Amino acid sequence: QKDVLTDLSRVRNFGIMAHIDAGKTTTTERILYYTGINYKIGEVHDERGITITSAATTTFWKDNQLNIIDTPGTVEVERNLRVLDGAVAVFDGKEGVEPQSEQVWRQADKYDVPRICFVNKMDKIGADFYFSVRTMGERLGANAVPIQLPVGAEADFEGVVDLVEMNAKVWRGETKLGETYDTVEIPADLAEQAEEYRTKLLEVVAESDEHLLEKYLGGEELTVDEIKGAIRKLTIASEIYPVLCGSAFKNKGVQPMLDAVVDYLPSPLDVPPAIGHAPAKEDEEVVRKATTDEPFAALAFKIATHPFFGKLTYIRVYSGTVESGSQVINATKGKKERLGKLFQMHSNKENPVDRASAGHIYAVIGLKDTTTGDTLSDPNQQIVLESMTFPDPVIEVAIEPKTKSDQEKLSLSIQKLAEEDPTFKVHLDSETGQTVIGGMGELHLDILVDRMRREFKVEANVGKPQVAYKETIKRLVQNVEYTHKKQTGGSGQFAKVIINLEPFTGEEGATYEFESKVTGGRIPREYIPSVDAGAQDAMQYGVLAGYPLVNLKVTLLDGAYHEVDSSEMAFKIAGSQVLKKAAALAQPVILEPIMAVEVTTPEDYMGDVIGDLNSRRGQIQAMEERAGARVVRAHVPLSEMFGYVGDLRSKTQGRANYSMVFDSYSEVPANVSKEIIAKATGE
Amino acid sequence: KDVLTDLSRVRNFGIMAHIDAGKTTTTERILYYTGINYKQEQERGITITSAATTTFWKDNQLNIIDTPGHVDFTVEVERNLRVLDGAVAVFDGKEGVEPQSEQVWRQADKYDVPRICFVNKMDKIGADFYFSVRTMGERLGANAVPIQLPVGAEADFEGVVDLVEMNAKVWRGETKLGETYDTVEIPADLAEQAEEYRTKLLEVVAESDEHLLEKYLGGEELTVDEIKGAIRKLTIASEIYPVLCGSAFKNKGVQPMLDAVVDYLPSPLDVPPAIGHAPAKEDEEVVRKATTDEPFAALAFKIATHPFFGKLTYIRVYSGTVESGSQVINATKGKKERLGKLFQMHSNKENPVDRASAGHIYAVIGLKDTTTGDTLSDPNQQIVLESMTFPDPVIEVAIEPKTKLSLSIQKLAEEDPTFKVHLDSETGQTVIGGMGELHLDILVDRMRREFKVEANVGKPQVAYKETIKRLVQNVEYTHKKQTGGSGQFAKVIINLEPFTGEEGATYEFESKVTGGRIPREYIPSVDAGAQDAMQYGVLAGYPLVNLKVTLLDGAYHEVDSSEMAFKIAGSQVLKKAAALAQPVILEPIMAVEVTTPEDYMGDVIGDLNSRRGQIQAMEERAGARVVRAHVPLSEMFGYVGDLRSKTQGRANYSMVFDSYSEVPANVSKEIIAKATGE
């Protein structure tokens, strides 16, 4: 394990995020080659092509250990950004930022993931570094700071102008795989435009630190280390995104890029510590820092089949150390696990290690009940990294497969997505064959339907998403009585029940309470729970619009029975009908899912954000300023949040991001309740 | 992937092994080799772990069963061994026979399950094939006959010597998943040791059949088919256990073992026919053969939740064939069921099938009142595959939430009919009834791992009962409460006697009223009142059983007498008559069966007698001793831990209800004192 670094400052866990056909595969291939041929030159103690096969590949660049993670490019990407400490964003110079990159960039923005940009395909016709860097501002609202400029356009691409050390690194002519660059003076053709972007970089660098601002403004020139260190601080704080260029296919620009990963991307020490919750006690927060002294905690993010080893579990260790053959707890499942062989996968070999320490990524063998997203931890000090509890779905969509083969494909999609997403719920009515999926939002459901149709090729009719409304009562209704007297064939059925129905808060979140005040055996004790079950069964339905009834307290006050005719079945009918009777007379109301929306926007677009939120019946809660940006917190009904992603992006020209969580159910306004009821009665 | 109708080409088997022995890695390799090799610089997932997985090896259908989780829960292990036709025993070459693998071996011995042995981890340092085969004889009393010999030791492990075909199958270098072997001649280093074990195998084969004994002794050499056929006969009869070796992690030896399952493990035709009983007629025996022509019979052995399909019931069909959308009867419950979609689960898909035929294992959909252990059968020829089990719980535990925040537990889940939930009303006081102390502990883990409740668990309490021993006559009670609005009146005179009943019934009500002295309108109310009072005790608050109430006389007021007043009268008169009929407390007596290693048997009988046990039999099965005894459940508390320490973890115990017996005098006073202490 001497090959695994314990100095986490010299470790970098990063991945490549890019649009498809942008060059992620070819860039990773070139990274792995250049890093191999430059490793232990004259220090090895003592044709070839690199393909990427492992989900995580470990390599070394200039005395730093680089753990590269294959980002799919969904819930899987959200997990990978937690496994990532930083990312390299690869763009196609012909197109700049593309619709796919927008989504991942905003998720990395949510989790404050430092990024550096590599504009690829600079050899191709139509590729432009300057146009592409514009699209980063226009569509991502990103402070993209070019740290280099291209030397040449289309076929004449030869290298890059280094804007930190003012020199040019050129690969002239047909460049061999792994061939180094020639360091030359900046060409005269580029001298002024280089000086313009040098000023832009120096101004950003000088404004970060007061000591350099006094130094820069005084006419003194900033040192390379001061410039380099300032860019790193800003990049790690997600303040700026350094931009590079090259041609991975033409073998131009890879080596400066690798330097940028070392120079400006964060180590396990630079990112904030891992925050999780105790196994139980979700509210209790547990924090695990990136040091071997802390208790062991690790997240499993990929399950794979190795051509030699069989089933392989990839894990990201955030804190502490564990050894091979030692027991750990799968905190997500509460089951014990024993770590088998431990590996760090290299480009062309499998490096076995004897223990799994903090800040590193490993492939584990002997795991039996660990799934992607599960947390492995010290048995004595247990942490769960992902939240285990989720509220019931608030939006539902209906899917009906077209053919009997689409039904079988839908059953293999609901199985693989269950493994990846525990947040979504599925139920199937075998009559009509209507699979209804519950989700956490319209976009969450929109993702699942797409993955069913593109990654699993289902052909089905998708319904329009329906908000999961509920019903409750606002008033106390007293001495509501119902009598069931059905004379079925032969012997009849009898049950009389008198209940008292009131709203019920639930101190700890309870939705229902049943109380029996029956005195003197007027209702036999054996029949009391049948009234409860009958009331609860009738609660499944609704008195107003057919939506479930919640926050009710049923008080069984009295009743009557015939010794022969009364049965558990009869007292369940009585409970059912009496609940429908009392709820109708107790001011029934409809409840709406309310969302806790938080929007981070620049000041200039903040007014346009609050105006949009007000139009969605939102209630503004806060107007904070965090990290030079303004954060608006508001409660918005989920019913009004349809299409927020596109509307926010249009109104704020792409510079604002948002997070939606469930908050509570609230009574629907009067004018909106009648619209809900009218639609439901017609459905 | 079609469904085979030639049941000779079918293998219903499972893997039994100690923990960390390689069950998961061997199952992984089986599923890969059977898929890619027969009917890579890669990485992928199918994320499927089915209770029963159907796969194919060389034109034979292999149905693999997941071995039960709770090894000490004897109801789960016996069910799976009934679903199994044969088993593959996986051992660690470094450790040989281990305590948990010993327990299942003796259980498989009880149920006559043919077994083959696979010595795994032969590439690990300290692994010895011959040491493991010695432990098979010393600790399992098993005629373990090696049909293979290891080629290499520890890191130099390369393959196996086949002792039937007398060749060597070697996997040289780093073996990829599914990589084939090279069949080579036995190395000279192993030629002598191979011939020694070849003679041992030939002698076992030759003594089986007289014809082969003539050929072997005559100097003629036995054919491969003759050796294979003899080993198969001996393996199916549990006379010999073939021994193999390999490395599941290093991908060496998997294909020979799959061959051994086909060659020497039993088919559905080779196992004895299914033996059951007619509903509610334990003495009447019904036999179902492994043929589609016989009436349909199937056992449900696993209930699971499918993400898309909902409830999934895994069934092992022993006899006949039934189609989708056809009705069957759940003989265990007496209710009818309609088979919905039928599935055979594969390593990477769900294969829909049109019928559930004999000798195969399926996943069923549309079942509502079928539980693990229930028997599905043709309505006309009703069979129950599992023996009758006591319904009422014998052990009770109290669970109280928190230390309302943890009322999340609804647990209306069918669970089993074995669990009964009743309320003593102390903070709700969910009291759960079970078949034993381990039974409840299994359920509590479900409530705490699958539902993560925070609760105080009580100490297990024996579910005692009460009864009467003498006849009491002319017991009268008069209910006269003059309430303001309306008064109430009811007089009843009853006769109370003990009543076992030819039908096994707990209660009998007879009315000998002569005139309309008690109106016919209120007779059923008196019966209900007596039954209500029987739920509670007269001595220590435990339910009363085996009572007969005879209503002899009474009185009524035309206005004041109601059904309620006579229910109070019937109730109070039973509490009064039972007190005067010599009430006694009854305790559940259990049929305990302990399978113990050779050495520790003596401590078992002494312990059982110290727990007020009555020894009934000792038998010798294989190399172990089986002690059967009748022991009161009250004295069996903590037996698992005491036996496991006493037998170094190598022994098995079974507890099933047997009968109720009167509690001894000094123990009756202890029970009563606690209850009166409330």
Ligand SMILES: Nc1nc2c(ncn2[C@@H]2O[C@H](COP(=O)(O)OP(=O)(O)O)[C@@H](O)[C@H]2O)c(=O)[nH]1
């Ligand atoms: N001319 C040119 N072609 C490139 C470059 N990078 C990638 N390509 C080509 O683009 C195609 C897709 O690139 P690929 O690595 O598969 O992108 P990915 O799908 O995002 O992983 C491949 O055929 C490459 O040959 C580049 O820098 N210049």
Ligand SMILES: Nc1nc2c(ncn2[C@@H]2O[C@H](COP(=O)(O)OP(=O)(O)O)[C@@H](O)[C@H]2O)c(=O)[nH]1
């Ligand atoms: N070296 C070696 N290790 C093995 C072999 N078979 C299993 N293992 C390892 O033993 C550990 C436990 O095996 P496992 O399949 O989980 O056994 P189980 O607990 O009974 O299911 C795992 O980490 C396996 O990788 C083998 O043939 N050789």
